Amino acid sequence: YYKANVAKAGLVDDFEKKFNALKVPVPEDKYTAQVDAEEKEDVKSCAEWVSLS
Amino acid sequence: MPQLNTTVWPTMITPMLLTLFLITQLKMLNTNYHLPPSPKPMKMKNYNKPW
Numbered sequence: 723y724y725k726a727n728v729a730k731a732g733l734v735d736d737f738e739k740k741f742n743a744l745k746v747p748v749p750e751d752k753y754t755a756q757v758d759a760e761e762k763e764d765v766k767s768c769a770e771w772v773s774l775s
Numbered sequence: 776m777p778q779l780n781t782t783v784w785p786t787m788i789t790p791m792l793l794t795l796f797l798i799t800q801l802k803m804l805n806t807n808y809h810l811p812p813s814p815k816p817m818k819m820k821n822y823n824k825p826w
Contacts, residue, residue: 771825 724734 768825 724738728734
């Protein structure tokens, strides 16, 4: 659709290429591990609590 | 008046002193009144929910 309508030289071409040459930064959490560890500690605490109870 | 016969006074005093101060007081001490049964339907030391 742009190859046959955009008469600009290489604009569609290099745009599409740099787009294919673009990789969006898929961000990493770095937030789940800590809540996992907190969950683990809470599990330990509730385990000892329920044993004593 | 026989009550005035001071010869036989100790034979009246002694057994009274025995039965009023020792025997009867004991037969009382054996009679005990336990406190009434009070089943407490509210006594629960439950710590705060653990949290």
